[PDB]
Amino acid sequence: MAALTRNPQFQKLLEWHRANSANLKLRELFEADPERFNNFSLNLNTNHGHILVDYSKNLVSKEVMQMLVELAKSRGVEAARDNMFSGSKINYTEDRAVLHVALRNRSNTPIKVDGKDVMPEVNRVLDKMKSFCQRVRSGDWKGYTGKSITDIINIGIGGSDLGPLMVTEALKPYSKGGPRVWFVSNIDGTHIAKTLASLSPETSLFIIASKTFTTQETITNAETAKEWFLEAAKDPSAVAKHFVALSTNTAKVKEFGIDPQNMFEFWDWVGGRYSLWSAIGLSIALHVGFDHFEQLLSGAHWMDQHFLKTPLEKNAPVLLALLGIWYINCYGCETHALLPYDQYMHRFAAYFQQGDMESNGKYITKSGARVDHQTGPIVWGEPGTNGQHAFYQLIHQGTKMIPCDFLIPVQTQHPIRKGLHHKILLANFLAQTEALMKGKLPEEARKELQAAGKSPEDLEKLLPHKVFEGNRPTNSIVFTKLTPFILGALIAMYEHKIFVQGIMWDINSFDQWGVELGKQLAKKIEPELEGSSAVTSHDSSTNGLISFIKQQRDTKL
Amino acid sequence: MAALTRNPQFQKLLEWHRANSANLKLRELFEADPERFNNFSLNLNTNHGHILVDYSKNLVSKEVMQMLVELAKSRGVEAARDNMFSGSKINYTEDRAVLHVALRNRSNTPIKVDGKDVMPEVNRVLDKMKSFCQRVRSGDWKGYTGKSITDIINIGIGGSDLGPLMVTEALKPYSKGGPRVWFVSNIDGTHIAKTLASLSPETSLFIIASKTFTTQETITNAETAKEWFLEAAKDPSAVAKHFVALSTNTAKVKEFGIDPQNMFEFWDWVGGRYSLWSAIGLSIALHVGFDHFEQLLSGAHWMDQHFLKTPLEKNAPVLLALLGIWYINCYGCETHALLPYDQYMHRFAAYFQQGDMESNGKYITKSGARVDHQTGPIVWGEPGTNGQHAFYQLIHQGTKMIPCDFLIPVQTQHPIRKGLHHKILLANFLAQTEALMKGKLPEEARKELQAAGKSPEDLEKLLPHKVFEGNRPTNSIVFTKLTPFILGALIAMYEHKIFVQGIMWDINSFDQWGVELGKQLAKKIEPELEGSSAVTSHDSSTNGLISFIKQQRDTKL
Ligand SMILES: O=P(O)(O)OC[C@H]1O[C@](O)(CO)[C@@H](O)[C@@H]1O
Ligand SMILES: O=P(O)(O)OC[C@H]1O[C@](O)(CO)[C@@H](O)[C@@H]1O
User: Fold this and answer.
1) Which chain B residue is nearest to residue A170, measuring alpha carbons?
2) Which of A62, A210, A500, B37 has the fewest CB within 10 Å, making it most exposed?
3) Which positions does the record annotate as the modified residue Phosphoserine (chains A, B)?
């Protein structure tokens, strides 16, 4: 077996679920206990806004929460957390520290890796970012024709793309005085082509973002950008005015031809999917200003301290993690929906697809044993209220159990029509979780059908279609306003949720060996596509698809 | 029980799965049979490009496919299809026909509802769309100050938003000479506010898209747009130059204040999530031109005829549906990933979230029986190659089985760098499904680690982490080019897949009762948010969340 399934607290939880989970009905839990909301929610005061984590609409009792907390303790969560924060090499397959918390360590308390405090270098790079942001935003940094920069283009993929994109989207109201920001990520030539079509080489600055600086998509895109730039500038020395790099790989950055002073460094203990807090966040700092970037870091730091100091039973990321374990390992739910009622947060779910799924989509434990249980869920979602008119039909009346996190700011960035739109948004946010919990009883639906003037025959037939079974669990995460600080806290909260789940599953949340095979096979196929010769080196499907490509690529439509 | 589970062909399939499915090994299936690709793929010649549906990397044999086709026959798929196409009222809970196929019926063969051919009215509205598009796109249509229209703004949600958005994104290269198109959908005031900030009332044309013309988000957004417009124009007669409606509800359109000559009608037998082919497609036709819109319809028509006339064993939407049933009802897979290797197709997955999940996220059958089996899956995905760097880790090395559809055009719209980007894109498309199929055996990983110079201790530690179990099934859908015609064919193909699955499950793919409760409860909460008084009328969570909103909404941040 595996560490989790051999754990007696887990076995107790699973046995309790088998015997008792059918007795858990949300409607009944609330009716029996008027203090339920009070006892199953956390109202966090950050001193820069409140974050309410309301987990009361979950299929849990006091006893279940107790069993879950006991499991976190007996799986070593507290010790593992302390090991992360102290610079222990908890990324055990790669023998690396895991120190995204150092990037936003506003206290500047020493954090050592190999006996050396990492904070001076973290702060050196942050200082460099601040100076660069001043130069660019002020207009002092000139392009090759002497004009101020108006557009920033981040080129990167995965962890070097999703964070900066999601955060600049979420913090758009804070971007006054900043350059426009663009994100090129896909190797698909459409991406860079459509981006470059709208830009001038005179006023565009490219940020080449890559931890390794060897990712094929990013380097190829970067080289395409450089070719486009040099077509207009016709001067290799002008590249230094229009290209900067964010990387750990000094040598590869030099090889590409980027100025050493134009390199913003980070470290191997910064995972790509945990990197927006580092040099990788340069496009964020350029767009919304360095002050707002520091606020983002500070919010994350607040949540780091919350995670570090708080007893597990009232520790927000721990509780979210534990509810997830309950649904994944006891109920068997494959997915987790993230439903932000905020258009600015439209890339939040996509971000946590990498954050969660690349971290915990794993099957080998620390001992080398294969898991004999589920690990990370499939994360998905779209902003409310849009989702209500897309897929909530299935959440309400399908055959799947889907834990959902509903998120919303109390205060909107755009209080148009004296707050009318936000009133409606909030009402929908509240009503949907209420609806998911309560459902609609046959007696309720029957009266509605009767009042609608339905015949006895029509009523009979329609009735079951109009019933909502309910008992569908949700979290509601409500916060004062989506400021840089609060966004930072929210992202950090989910980072630590993911960490806790990984520890409980005994997996490594911080490596990504599962991307290797696809990369290897793509390197083999690339040269085979050129020319007219038949490819026979693969299975018949791969060969057949290549044959189709070669036959169809010259056809004129 | 329910129709599917009571069906003897289904029980035979399920029994076969229990006894034999563990013996299906993709790597071995391909090695043993060089004809596998040929026997498990469909190369469709539309005369306007080819669509290759390669389903050979699925966990199926000849026997499995035979059983699935027999099940489709036993479930009356052909008769149900014919009934849809003939105008029978197969939406039985609403007593409506289901006739998105009539919208693109290029043959003009009569299709009757209530004894009356619907084609004359379909074509009348199409002619109106054509005339309007010519007037706007030519610059002839002038705004209230006498300027040509530069911006089109679609206001709508769900079925009145997702189709037009997805298609205008996918067909962006075909939009030269067309006005800019914007989509406003969320009630969240951010959506309309940030859109209006970039527009002039003099040169903006609003399209109010709503089947019912009573949806709160859409009517509120429309009223906000009208107020903004009238603040500038100060003349109610000017509204007729700047607002058009796409609806079935003439009375409510008139009540809003839109001219009857500015209404583009559709019909009750056009489902919202099947509506882009109707008047709802006006923003598509305006953006890319009516000719390209007609090509889109024509592509769908081709696929309709394929679905109608082809034996089930060679019928693309039927086979895709059956493979889906195999994974959903025999393997128990909750999800289905759509992974287009095309940046222009970045909203394709979101579109089929509504199309699939709102259609088949159901639990009551035609007999009135509650299903005792799974219905529609959770649909999700992001375009390749981005997904590879976000969540493919989980697909390769997680604990979930996830059927994936990989899609790509052979010809790119942007063959930059002499085709280099598209070469790399294609290589990744091919490699990923190869990798998912093949995996990497412990002995294969061992040899790789030994070659890398790893010590016996280092090798043994890393080995299990480097193993890929493989046997992960995919479809590869490859097409000559993503033209309007081919896109139309692809969308229709999935529409019919969804139809076939719904018939087999004995559910109604065409209603959506599951959205009612959320709407009702939101109407109740709306007025309660007004004022400072505490709300005690709900469960303690809803009450508590409302208390938090009221306490937090005045804080300065
Ligand atoms: O076009 P309407 O009538 O405004 O409806 C919008 C959407 O809301 C729904 O009725 C409910 O999700 C969808 O079916 C529809 O597409
Ligand atoms: O920043 P890099 O080195 O270009 O890597 C990009 C992405 O590719 C991965 O290494 C593999 O998906 C991610 O972890 C990472 O975020």
Assistant:
1) B190
2) A62
3) 86, 107, 185, 455
3-state class (DSSP) for residue A366: coil
At B490 the three-state DSSP class reads: helix
Question: Measured between beta carbons, which residues in chain B are less than 8 angstroms from residue A523?
Answer: 427
Contact indicator for B358, B350 with CB cutoff of 8 Å: no
Whether A248 lines ligand 2, by a CB cut-off of 6 Å, is no
| Rounded Cα gap, residues A226 and A216, in angstroms | 15
For every residue of A101-146, DSSP letters joined together read: HHHT-TT----EETTEESHHHHHHHHHHHHHHHHHHHHT-SB-TTS
Domains detected in chain A: 1-99+295-515 (3.40.50.10490), 100-294 (3.40.50.10490), 516-556 (1.10.1390.10)
Which candidate in A12, A314, A389, A523 is catalytic? Answer: A389
Decide if B512 contacts B96 (C-beta within 8 A). Answer: no
Angle at B107 between CA B102 and CA B110, to 5 degrees: 55
Judge if the beta carbon of residue A216 lies within 6 A of ligand 2.
no
Rounded to a whole number of angstroms, the CA Rg of chain B reads 26
Pairing label, strands B116-117, B50-54:
unpaired
Residue of B211, B252, B278, B515 best suited for mutating to test ligand 1, as the one with most atoms within 8 Å of CB: B211
Technique behind the model: X-ray
Q: Report the residue of chain A nearest B345, measured CA to CA.
A: A190
A254 is annotated as an active-site residue: no
B189 and A425 within 8 Å at the Cβ level: the answer is yes
Residues ≥6 apart with Cβ < 8 Å to B428: A187, A518, A522, B341, B384, B385, B388
Tell me if residue A379 falls in helix, strand or coil. Answer: strand
Instruction: Please state the φ and ψ torsions of residue A146, each to the nearest 5 degrees.
Output: 90, 15
* DSSP code at position A182: E
User: Is the beta carbon of A232 within 6 A of some atom in ligand 2?
Assistant: no
Give the resolution in Å: 1.5
Nearest CA among A115, A83, A203 for reference residue A153: A203
Q: Does B159 contact ligand 1 (Cβ within 6 A)?
A: yes
Q: Provide the 8-state DSSP code for A83.
A: H
Helix (H) or strand (E) holding A336: strand A335-340
- What distance in Å separates the CA atoms of residue A496 and residue A98, rounded to the nearest whole number? 12
Ligand 2 geometric centre to CA of A160 (Å): 7
